[PDB]
Symmetry: D3
Subunit: 256 residues, 6 copies
């Protein structure tokens, strides 16, 4: 199957257009919507979203990702062939997902070849419908990427900077994601299970417990989350609205 | 076919993870989204949504519902087997849907027996991806619930208070649901159709008509609705904003 | 394949019911969601959405559209048979889509004939679930529209006025759509590529470029768009935000 | 759903080619094999097979039948549009099936229009793969027959003579089919339940019972059958074996 | 999915009729043909065939088996609910398959209930199309057997005698199956790997090797087979035509 | 989509086992039967059948072919990757199909790596169910062959002699296939179309016409055929029985 991640929004024809276009090229493709509400142009959030889906997807799955603020410009459209596939703009969007994929090859999609398979013209502002979507549909049915692209160096693709630095014993982490519940996710993984977590920027000591219900309603806590990162949440409340933080912001955190 | 109802939200990887996880267990399950926008942790609301879908669903349909504020706590995860199936947390979510299901037996999902099918660790904060989703996928492909759970008494599961109260011929109804148009659904059903409905708390008299268009724009009415419950609405307006009521509120009502 | 376009909203059971009702009629129908977030009762907006999807859908595709403020009134429920199908309320919703369909026949759905196929009572406020959904599903599995309807004149159906007028060298263009990015779409097509677009009501002179990134972040511009309509946008910003416009407004535009 | 009935045989690539050709036109078509073992060029036998399948197929079903001894000659290739479809060579193959289809229109497939859809050259000896298969597939995904054909008179098509004649009290019945068990099927239907059936050509008086087991193993009998035609059988034996008959022979039968 | 095993034959409409009937009741059922060439009325061979398929089928699979010489008589039509399902005539056909199924319940299908789900009349000679097939299709979509049958004692079903006896050191086995290659299968399993195998009825000593190619072309051998029984084969020849044996025949075999 | 071609035969559990085994690995693989009636162990015949199917198959199609007399021996099991995929035993079966596949690489299936995917023991006499079928199902769902095999040189695989020989202007052609009608296919292709074809060995002169019907019933002709090879046939008769030739025989032929 093919998963879809974009920032197109839900109030319009964009998502539908991409889907029917994909079905034109592969009518029996099983298309799974991850989300289309990724913050406009937010490559980092889009990357986090895909990273999570990729972690639980069956090997052989095709992932189309489209947070393309640079659509129409000279940025490359690539295909990452490996354990699973990634069809995304060469803008760093593949960074997080790549952490969980055994890469075999990378290909730059060639617009002229892709239009050979689609039949319709390639717009300058909607590549998800004219390039990325079709490309995903082609791979799903067995077409090799070589057929519509040229290989490129694996290490020649834009990579985002998502790893945290540490000043002594203090962690300087960043908010890589915020869900609809207001739960805040921080770019810290593989750490040792703390007993407490202090958000030095707020002079708050937090209990580090397994789940929301372990603290009373309205109270804040830290948990190992469900995506292997450090999570900060308010039981039945919004941790984001408390600490009043955003994706991209940095926080000094000390793990006790 | 499997239906999905959650409070997960639309911008995140949550829904996508549960779907690929389900497909990873039953690669050709037909998954139908109901909604993922149920007000956060609102079991009553989630229960109303499931009730409606269950009423029109083909017999044999499997319904996965995840509004689970108590995720990872002592609360049980259950499977209800009958006319159709319900796979939800044991927190009352099944209350309304149960009204339309010929129940044969109920089972408690035993985590370890489930992990034997999935192959991956059960998180403490995302049972929709690690327990409920997989359980639904298994039932869908023919696996009996006994395979991953132990039978329990129907009467043992948690239930919500959903009965309307009547003081003489004044009804004390509860707002069980408000849709995107602001139409207010009150928990009154199977009543003699009135000519007028008066909302005693607002000193309003409303005509009881069959549809929105039967009154001028901006005018308020009461109708049979499409879900067998008494509906209050404003033709092309929002009864919820005009009456300023929220799910859970109680209204003194008299039918003339 | 069947497409869906409604103004039902995503926070509710409405979309779920229509779908399970459809799958009940034709259990193996492939249903593709276009959108259910169309502004309440906005027939024009719905019409634009459908037009775009129809242009890229394969021939044979069935399109169910439901933006029905007059549900339950005397307004007709029709089926437009052509190289693609449209199942919609006779309220002008089919106006734009018709521009890309060569119509063969038009039918008026007879409620009593449809009930013979569904088996359940038809409500007064939810025809999408009891009439339109079923109709689309029946056509999808091969049933001829005549079985549940009678032929009517192609030009007897409601039409919206979507044509832009020009006085002198000034275009009076209407905002037929606004997307989640705030990009504004005007009802002007088949025009000669301008160098600059002037929005007289704002004293704004905008550059006509190929894509968003061709200007600085925050700068406004005009583009050929990706839907064959003049598009007013703000690089990574909201054009509708600034111009403070909304679907339906008419702008005086000068093409230089 | 599309059904297939041919005389291609099972020891070859013929059936495989027609199928992959069809899936090439409509990759998600559900193809159901009826039989490909019809006696070579036996149009009558093919017609009986199709009749039976048509009687139980759901409305909307497309039936491709290919028993084509005159492939490549001037014989027409037609499409019979009704509450069910028939895609067959105009050689009388549709005779029996028509008895259960209310015909709406009949078309003559235009080779050049079909080639526009397939993309490959049309052979002279394998139209099932290059014309009929494609035609069925196109209709299945929603393309109207008119796109690749022109309407022709319903009664302008070849018909077989399948009516049984009666002289006095003696029926002259034809063997329209013989199954793998050797059970013989005569073209007599809508007759009053006899007590005994006499096969004059054999001086055999047979008992008319409900099923095989109602007589001794090895004994011959007559039954109402399961296809609404008089059936001559031998309990766990071959009736055609003994009577030494074959599809096409005419038996003089007396109904007592 | 549903598997199908019958003795209907391939030259006719029987198999097709059952399939379309099943799709009427469950149009998205995945139907897999095991075989339809089981020797007429041969319950033992039919049982062996099913036993093998059941061994490799996914849990939850539904198996419809129809070798029904007693069709129309008073023999019971049952459903065996367990690890997997068996929908077959109560004539011993379930014997072998039951060896690999964790049985939960057994049900006698009630003709009157089944016709409630089908809509068409139940013939006396074709229960595969009017009872067994529909029943299989119902279970595949989630309907419980209780819905169209009444439970009966697990041990009240006809069982075939398939186990071998042993006179001292000599085995008196029977031929339970013969494939198209002429390979002979004998009802002996779980035995200790012999070095030689003597067919005392022919005064032949046979090498007991892993596969056909281990002996020269035309030579006979014994192997553990691929179905866990003792197999007798002629490399690239017919072992059945040599020993000139049939299904059901007994052979005195001594394992050295 | 996956096609299947074998010499398994039609009456047995062999084909059914391979299909459920495949579905057990890839539950939603679309499996298309070509034939299972290839003359026992005839690699040449099996190769011809696959060639034809491959010619009309959509790019990306996976073709599983099992005619494997050397099953369980030293013979390798291979996967050929390219335009489409071939999964067959390394015994020459791929010879003809290879002519129509743009080969990218070839792999040898490593038994132990395959068992890691299936979960069950590999038999010594049924690799179609334990190796070839599973391998095809894996490729179909996106698994790269590298995952269960090691690359090998294209030129290393076994190949059949299939070239036609010419002695001056007499051709020495081979009967590469005979279908169910008795039409004889000779291994001659891309030749200047003749007016007459004389079979020197029978002192027969045959007209070269486009189809069967162009000669009287019972008469013999030569035609282009539908598979690009020279075909000899008898209008409504059997050229194979008239010439009394079998696959593999050689005929001295001259084109005038
Ligand atoms: N106004 C805009 N400015 C910049 N990018 C835009 C704008 N509107 C749409 N895009 C989109 O940005 C998305 C990635 O953020 C791409 O899918 C691209 O289509
Ligand atoms: N901050 C939170 N407090 C309580 N429950 C939560 C919180 N975030 C998510 N959940 C619940 O946990 C599950 C997965 O998000 C859902 O039941 C969801 O409603
Ligand atoms: N309050 C409302 N007023 C008018 N239309 C509504 C309202 N709520 C929903 N509708 C939508 O418009 C149709 C007619 O009212 C309904 O079936 C639904 O599609
Ligand atoms: N030898 C033959 N003579 C006549 N018909 C044949 C012959 N072989 C195949 N056919 C079948 O009849 C059609 C016309 O000959 C062919 O397309 C095929 O369907
Ligand atoms: N002539 C016959 N005698 C006995 N049984 C028959 C005969 N013809 C068909 N049957 C079939 O026997 C099959 C089982 O052997 C059943 O499917 C039943 O339909
Ligand atoms: N008796 C036999 N001798 C040689 N090969 C056989 C024999 N029986 C089956 N096979 C082959 O083994 C595989 C499974 O039957 C196929 O390749 C088949 O042709």
């Amino acid at each position: 199957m093919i998963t879809l991640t974009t920032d197109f929004g839900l109030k319009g024809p964009y998502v539908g257009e991409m889907k029917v276009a994909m079905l034109r090229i592969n009518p029996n493709a099983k298309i799974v919507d991850v989300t289309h509400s990724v913050t406009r142009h937010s490559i980092l959030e889009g990357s986090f979203v895909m990273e999570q889906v990729v972690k639980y997807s069956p090997k052989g799955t095709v992932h189309v990702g489209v947070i393309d603020p640079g659509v129409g410009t000279e940025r490359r459209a690539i295909v990452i062939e490996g354990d699973q596939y990634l069809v995304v703009p060469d803008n760093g969007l593949a960074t997080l997902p790549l952490k969980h994929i055994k890469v075999k090859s990378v290909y730059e999609i060639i617009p002229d070849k892709i239009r050979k398979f689609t039949g319709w013209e390639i717009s300058s502002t909607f590549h998800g419908r004219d390039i990325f979507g079709p490309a995903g549909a082609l791979i799903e049915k067995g077409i090799h990427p070589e057929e519509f692209g040229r290989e490129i160096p694996v290490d020649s693709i834009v990579k985002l900077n998502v790893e945290p630095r540490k000043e002594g014993d203090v962690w300087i982490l960043k908010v890589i994601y915020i869900d609809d519940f207001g739960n805040v996710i921080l770019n810290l993984e593989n750490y040792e299970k703390p007993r407490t977590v202090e958000l030095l920027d707020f002079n708050l000591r937090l209990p580090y417990l397994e789940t929301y219900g372990l603290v009373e309603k309205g109270e804040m806590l830290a948990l190992p989350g469900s995506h292997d990162y450090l999570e900060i949440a308010v039981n039945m409340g919004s941790a984001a609205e408390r600490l009043n933080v955003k994706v991209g912001d940095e926080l000094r955190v000390r793990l006790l």
